[PDB]
Design a binder for this molecule. Structure first.
Ligand SMILES: Nc1ncnc2c1ncn2[C@@H]1O[C@H](COP(=O)(O)OP(=O)(O)O)[C@@H](O)[C@H]1O
Ligand SMILES: Nc1ncnc2c1ncn2[C@@H]1O[C@H](COP(=O)(O)OP(=O)(O)O)[C@@H](O)[C@H]1O
Ligand SMILES: [Mg+2]
Ligand SMILES: [Mg+2]
Ligand SMILES: [Mg+2]
Lengths: 575, 578
């Protein structure tokens, strides 16, 4: 009283599940036999045998796999999968024999079951026979002509012999299956169609993979493998073509946990324990080779699909990789993509930035923020942008960490535009021009440092990075910037709890002023005229607090800042 | 670790014995656990004991247990790579004789460096178990005394639930050293305070008293004895026994996640003994035991002295009590009574909800709160201005969980909660004041309509005369079921650090209620110049800046700091003479 006639949509999937289950039973007895010599005592062979029965209206799926004990026949046989057998039959008869127990039978009509002993005894040796009593409607599955194609379809990647009872012109078993694994075949003998059809066989339906790679590893260890990149955000391990496990969760590093595939080695031990084989020295050589072939796979993807598709899905993985993977860092560095001032939305690689650098530019400039808009509208990038330097914009929380794990790219050091180190060159006769303006505005500097912003600024200097903005707060090289304040301060608030007593944390920054900006020109002209004035003092403080938000730091006191604004607003209105 | 582990523990070198008894007990727990599903698991050696022999003559100290033992492969993994290396504090050479049920008897020898495992020439001596033999070093060769071990076992192996015997003298025969009866099985009244504390230290280290403990016995649906503890610090857990037999410490569902810091013992005589681990964890009686553990933990937490509760417990585990209010529906009332928050009543002191209620006005029915990233932000907010003046108390919520905590508690002792940053704040009003406000609202209508229809058109829901401001000119009030600045902040950070951009949200980018203060000089002046000339740009420009600043003051994010900086600039030029 559930499915039966709705999923149905996938009308003949019952066989796929019974063939799949039989293969799983076959894999399991084989796996045990590698440690237990007397495991294959009941049956020499490892097969799946399907028998058509017209007269009695029956269909048998017989496997010589592990089998099931009475206790297992109760739990395992219940509620695609085993139950899908009821999409074509109204009664399932499961005859099973296991090594540790005698032979039993199981019969359910989708509602109630019964686990009797077999009055015939041990007729299987070891394994199971799934007898389906077909419905009058789905009785077409008794036909030998149709059932042959039905197994040829759902067992293209089953690596155990599948036989069906047929005849010629003499009844006998016929192989419908080729058990030569797909990963063991010559690279170009395998069509692209087959690679995609293999991907859907173990990832349980869905669409094609984004990319794949099939290779024979050479050198210290030799193995065959087909790895896959999925479309949206499990490595099977075989030894000498014998399935071992898919539960070795550390086959790939955490940052590549999305890769799917098979590994098949002739150089690893077969008759050893699963624990033993997990710590084996050669396996680690396989793991390091999987990473490199995976990065080779990722690099083989075409430029547009790489940016618009791969990167959108796994970009955070490459960033986590850069930090976590020391050996493959340089390779991971080239796979990174970030938005830059070059274009309003296109993402750029680090190489592309490099090729665009000016002849005498030694630094890769970056601005970090919570969004594209705040990063690009920052005062810090004003003159760099005007002079034609490109600035990388980092908008994600991991970006900062990512670049920090990268001490250089292609000989160039990264420079945060919110910190000191932004280089602006000049000639001899150009150096004096600045130095004159620098000493002209020096009274305004000392006044800000010893009165207007006495213990609120580390120092005041004449900026060379601003064009439109009057001023900005710049942090020390070993200090925390605006964005890093957030990243750390909103994690010290979320998880940390009280983190203020730190040297380069909440420390005074360098207050830079724009000499060409009217509010600095007036402030200078007016500071040499009174100094005791609270008006310009209120101007210096309001400008400093505005510059703070502008620079990306929090305000120490919103009430004090508010009180100052409203006092100016009084002036602007009264006269 | 290497050879600099001896100097770090030169103080505590007598502890080597504790470490050998602890392991023997661990070995005995393991073999006894196997025997619950395996009938013939004790066929090699029937008893479960700890035997210690003094052999002065050969310079050897023997510690013979009858536990699980070690196989060939287990000797080359477990031994080598506090602990077992503790034996080297008193012995230069250490040899272990051992016998496991699956293997034959082997001898492991080492000094610290290389190791070698040989098949014992004598053969299967112990049936099962291990003998740790110490070649006691000269400068510590005094433990081979017929009374020194006698005294150490008695003071150290307290709480070991297996019989420990030393090869004494009187005729040489084994003399019992300890009492096998567990501390949790003894009647509450009889157990000493020191004994409870020493018990806490035995299974969790940390060498300091626990913050609190509870020793109870459960009657009714299920019976079990238990001792539960509150540690002193938040670490940055519960041993189950069935009929005095250790089963596991791997059940991570004994306590709900919010009480994960609780450590202790549960000894049940009702649970199935001769069954598997899988079977026992899913067992229906456990859910009954769990509910009892939570109620008893809460009893203990409630029993802590008022001063100690706020000063020590609340600082360590207040977040857990907050998550509890959200997750534990059947205990909500008990937990809500345990909450502590900062409030206006005092600069730093925290307060319970009962204490707040008692301080409420005779006709106040709402518990008012202000949420924010810090106390400074919350107390200097515009929203508490009037309430504070008129003597209402405002709870201050500064941790991100606090809002979800209050938002999960619909009422406390009949009083609903109200966020001052939202619509819903009330003030009892004398007939004189009520009418005075009515005249203020009609007088200020021209300023309210100008703001809503042109000056701030499309920025605000409506412009109204406030009842909550005092010193502040204006503020942004969110709707009854909308997001406060604090919720906007928490959601934006969760949509950035974890989420994948919630720009086009549900109610994050929504207009707020702009409340203006009629008694504020700047607003008074703003009314005068608007009626005189509505199309004056200087007042329109001012309106924007006042609003934008009000947005920072109201705890909201400003939508364009660049444009706002530039408007503040224009204002500064006009304010001065640029
Ligand atoms: N032919 C079989 N031989 C042995 N065991 C089987 C067989 N068919 C089913 N089982 C057991 O019962 C379970 C039922 O299969 P199914 O419903 O497909 O679940 P699964 O996805 O794990 O295979 C299997 O996991 C297996 O434990
Ligand atoms: N008496 C013993 N009987 C059996 N195994 C032991 C014994 N002593 C030590 N071992 C083995 O050595 C391991 C390490 O002991 P120790 O260093 O104290 O670590 P731990 O107490 O945390 O297990 C034990 O876990 C066990 O595998
Ligand atoms: Mg299945
Ligand atoms: Mg004021
Ligand atoms: Mg400007």
């Amino acid at each position: 009283k559930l499915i039966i006639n709705s999923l149905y949509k996938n009308k003949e999937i019952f066989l796929r599940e019974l063939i799949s289950n039989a293969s799983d039973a076959l894999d399991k007895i084989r796996l045990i036999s590698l440690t237990d010599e007397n495991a294959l005592a009941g049956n020499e062979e490892l097969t799946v045998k399907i028998k058509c029965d017209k007269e009695k209206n029956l269909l048998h799926v017989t496997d010589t796999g592990v089998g099931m004990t009475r206790e297992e026949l109760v739990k395992n046989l219940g509620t695609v999968g085993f139950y899908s057998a009821f999409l074509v039959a109204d009664k399932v008869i499961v005859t099973s024999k296991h090594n540790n127990d005698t032979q039993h039978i199981w019969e359910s009509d989708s509602n109630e079951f019964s686990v009797i002993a077999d009055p015939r005894g041990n007729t299987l040796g070891r394994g199971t026979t799934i007898t389906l009593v077909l419905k009058e409607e789905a009785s077409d599955y008794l036909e030998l002509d149709t059932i042959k194609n039905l197994v040829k379809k759902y067992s293209q990647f089953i690596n155990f012999p599948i036989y069906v009872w047929s005849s010629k012109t003499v009844w006998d078993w016929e192989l419908m299956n080729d058990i030569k694994p797909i990963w063991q075949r010559p690279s170009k003998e395998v069509e692209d169609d087959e690679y995609k059809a293999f991907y859907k066989s173990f990832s349980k339906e869905s669409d094609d993979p984004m990319a794949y790679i099939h290779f024979t590893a050479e050198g210290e260890v030799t193995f065959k493998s087909i790895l896959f990149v999925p479309t949206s955000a499990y490595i099977k391990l075989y030894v000498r073509r014998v399935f071992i496990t898919d539960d070795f969760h550390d086959m790939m590093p955490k940052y590549l946990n999305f890769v799917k595939g098979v590994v098949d080695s002739d150089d690893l031990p077969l008759n050893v324990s699963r624990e033993t084989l997990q710590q084996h020295k050669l396996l680690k050589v396989i793991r390091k080779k999987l990473v490199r072939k995976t990065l080779d796979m990722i690099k083989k993807i075409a430029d547009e699909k790489y940016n618009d598709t791969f990167w959108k899905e796994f970009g955070t993985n490459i960033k986590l990789g850069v930090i976590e993977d020391h050996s493959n860092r340089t390779r991971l560095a080239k796979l990174l993509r970030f938005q830059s001032s070059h274009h309003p939305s296109d993402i750029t690689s680090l190489d592309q930035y490099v090729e665009r650098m000016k002849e005498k530019q030694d630094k890769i400039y970056f601005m970090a923020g919570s969004s594209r808009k705040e990063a690009e509208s920052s005062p810090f990038v004003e003159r760099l942008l005007k002079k034609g330097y490109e600035v990388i914009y980092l908008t994600e929380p991991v970006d900062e960490y990512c670049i920090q794990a990268l001490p250089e790219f292609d000989g160039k050091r990264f420079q945060n535009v919110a910190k000191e180190g932004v280089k602006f060159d000049e000639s001899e006769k150009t150096k004096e021009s600045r130095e004159a303006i620098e000493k002209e505005f020096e009274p305004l500097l000392n006044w800000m440092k010893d009165k207007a912003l006495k213990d609120k600024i580390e120092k005041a200097v004449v900026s060379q990075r601003l064009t439109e903005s009057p001023c900005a707060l710049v942090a020390s090289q070993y200090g925390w910037s605006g964005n890093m304040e957030r990243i750390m301060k909103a994690q010290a608030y979320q998880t940390g709890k009280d983190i203020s007593t730190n040297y380069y944390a909440s420390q005074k920054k360098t207050f830079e002023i724009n000499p060409r900006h009217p509010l600095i020109k007036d402030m200078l002209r007016r500071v040499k005229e009174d100094e005791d004035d609270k008006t310009v003092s209120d101007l210096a403080v309001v400008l400093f607090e505005t510059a703070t938000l502008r620079s990306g730091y929090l305000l120490p006191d919103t009430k004090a800042y508010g009180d100052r604004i409203e006092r100016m607003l009084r002036l602007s209105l009264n006269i």
